[PDB]
Design a protein around this nucleic acid. Sequence first.
DNA 1: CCACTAACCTGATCACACC
DNA 2: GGTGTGATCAGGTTAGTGG
Length: 122
Amino acid sequence: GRRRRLVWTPSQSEALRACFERNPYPGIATRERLAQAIGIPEPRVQIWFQNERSRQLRQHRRESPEGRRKRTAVTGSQTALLLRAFEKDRFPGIAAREELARETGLPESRIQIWFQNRRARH
DNA sequence: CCACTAACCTGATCACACC
DNA sequence: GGTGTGATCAGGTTAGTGG
C-alpha cells in the first residue's frame, strides 16, 4: 500500500523542469519555495528531482552546493516508538507511516527516511 | 498490450554531533 | 579516529497513467 500517485499539471511540469535546468541539485530552500509556488508537497518535489536526474543521466549515457535540510531531531520517546514498530514490520505502508507520523509528531517523509536508514543498518 | 514514470527501494556516502 | 544517525547521492524496482 503506497501513496496515491499524483499527476502533474502542465504548469507544474514547466516549473519543475525550468528549476531543474538552472540547478539539478537544489537545496531544501529551493525545494520548499518551488513546492509552494506550484502547490505540491516538498517531498514529492524532492522525489521528482531524484527521478529526473535518473532520467537525464541514463539519457546522457547513451548520447554524450546548496544547503541541505536541517537534521531532524528525534527524541528517545519517538525513537522507542518507531523501534517497536520496526520490529513488527520493517516495511510499513503509507497508512502505517501516517499512523507513526501522527503518534510521533514527525512528518511522514521523515518516517520513510528513518525506516530506509534503519533497514540498511539493523 | 505496452511505454512512461511517481513512488519506493538498496547501497553508499555525505554531514554533523559527540566522545 | 571511532560511532551513531539523519539526509542525499546513483540508480534499480514496483505499480499507476494513459497512449
